[PDB]
Amino acid sequence: MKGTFVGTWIKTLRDLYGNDVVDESLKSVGWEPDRVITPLEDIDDDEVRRIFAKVSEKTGKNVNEIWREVGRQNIKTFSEWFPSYFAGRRLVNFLMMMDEVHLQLTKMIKGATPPRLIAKPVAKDAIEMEYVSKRKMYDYFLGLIEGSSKFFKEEISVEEVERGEKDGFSRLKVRIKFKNPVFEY
């Protein structure tokens, strides 16, 4: 994973659980709590897992709940960094462009493997969106959806339809219902 994003995650963990909890967890992995994450570096997926596992241990919070909350908070951060994706858009449009955004933002990186986030209309007031990734970040995905709803101040209902692994990929399909219509033309 990329550095300052994970850096973002770590910052969020500090806000939720305190500096003490986070410092120790970073220390348990061989980091200095005040280690600088450079603007370019990349941090391994498996060290992230270990960090989150330790924060879970020390807070008693299940790691899936922690990921969900990190996802909910992360949307705000992405609005600081990529304001154009948020400006002048409604929630439905925002969610519908996510698959492309993740391709566009990683296409320059050798060996990149972004999540796929394909969405399509399934009713006049609803989309189905499918998470597809080797990383199995199901709760982060769901949390990001919830955080988007909060950020845009547009209420939604989210129903999980399918979950599981296939072809070496994790997949999670949800149906998202918007409060008033969005696919009538």
53-82 residues in contact with ligand HEM (CB under 6 A) are: 78, 82
**CB-based contacts of 23, cutoff 8 Å, min separation 6:** 33
Question: Does residue 103 belong to the site contacting ligand HEM (CB under 6 A)?
Answer: no
Breaks (C-N over 2.5 A) in the chain follow: none
The one segment of 15-23, 26-34, 105-113, 173-181 that binds ligand HEM by CB under 6 A: 105-113
Q: In which residue are the tokens 């960094």 written? A: 81
Residue from the set 16, 63, 101, 118 that interacts with ligand HEM by CB under 6 A:
101
Question: Does residue 161 belong to the site contacting ligand HEM (CB under 6 A)?
Answer: no
Hey, how many other C-beta atoms are within 10 angstroms of the C-beta on 154?
Answer: 16
Contact between residue 170 and residue 182 where contact means Cβ atoms under 8 Å apart: no
The one segment of 12-20, 27-35, 62-70, 143-151 that binds ligand HEM by CB under 6 A: 143-151
With vertex at residue 110, the alpha carbon angle to CA 104 and CA 113, rounded to the nearest 5 degrees, is 60
Site residues (vs ligand HEM, CB under 6 A): 1-2, 78, 82, 85, 98, 101-102, 105-106, 112-115, 117, 131, 133, 135, 137, 140-141, 144-145, 148
